[PDB]
Amino acid sequence: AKSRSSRAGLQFPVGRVHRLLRKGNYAERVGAGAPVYLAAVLEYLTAEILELAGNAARDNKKTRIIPRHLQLAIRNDEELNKLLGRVTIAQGGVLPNIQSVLL
Amino acid sequence: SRRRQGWLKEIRKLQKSTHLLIRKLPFSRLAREICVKFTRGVDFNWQAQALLALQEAAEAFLVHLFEDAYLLTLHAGRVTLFPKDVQLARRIRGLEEGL
Amino acid sequence: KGLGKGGAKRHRKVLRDNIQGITKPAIRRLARRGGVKRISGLIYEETRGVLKVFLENVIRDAVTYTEHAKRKTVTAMDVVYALKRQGRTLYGFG
Amino acid sequence: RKESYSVYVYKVLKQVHPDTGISSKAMGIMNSFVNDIFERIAGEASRLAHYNKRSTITSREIQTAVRLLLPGELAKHAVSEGTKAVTKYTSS
């Protein structure tokens, strides 16, 4: 009577990762320690791009994260740029960018 | 004489052939220093097919960079390059083809 | 940047050159193939910058395949695989 | 009947923000962000187990896939927070 995820301490479901990672035929046999270790990295990224967006919610003074605030949280970071390189965002908009040189 | 012809003998020569252009033993001692800044402590061991595998990618990358950087000099009325024309040729290029 | 710091013995640990083996006419003869009709006097510093940041986006992808299968030897198939995930597929040695 | 991560991601936001809400379209982006990281990593860790000609994706052959699909400083934390998950999973 214990959840697998509470053995790790994280929040993303260990079993749903362990269910999907056999059904796609990524390998014919899936180890035990693997879909715990993947459940951390998938949470540490999604706890990283929210905290930037969550600190972008107060600074523009809207307390609900609307899909603009993801766009200004991804493109205003050096290291999250290279991960989401060839990826656009729906309802996105761009960075506030004009330079003075044109103005 | 003073100036018979300086460059047009040389460019049509070098595009004709298929040699390597950076000498191997300096190009090895650039890699082994950069190979030891990662995976600290252990200097690794290189097969001799691996050094001829970077050099047919490095000297095929930079020859695609300079040619595609040279189309920015002709767009500004120059002839000579500048470090404006390499810094701008990487930013247009788009973050996955040379950073 | 400059990790595994140079001054473990004294300053100027660049002893002969260690970077300037990419000689002055070599960067010339690279650009002569591309159609550079004339090279300005700062590209000799510039290409040494770009070539240092091309190796750190190959060898980081190349030593990792080497360190994975527990070895000490980078093979030819490791660099071909590392450039394949990079976006520059190489047809020489695969 | 198609399942999402919408109950999960909403629990992550409460651990770092006690009062921030999320719009019902922004949860849609937090689907195709986390499957795109998922379909890369398992779809790239398959290539190592096919290279060395083993047949078990273990907890090791995700780690060298994590150090490829990430840039520089994001690498050192995501593996160190990753190994914190396995060590208190074995010693339970």
Binding site: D77, E78 | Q87, L88, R91 | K1, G2 | E73
Partner: peptide
Amino acid sequence: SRRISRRPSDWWVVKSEE
């Protein structure tokens, strides 16, 4: 924990040790 988030990310200009 916390890392350093670098706001501009000026990356195309090569920059030496100075």
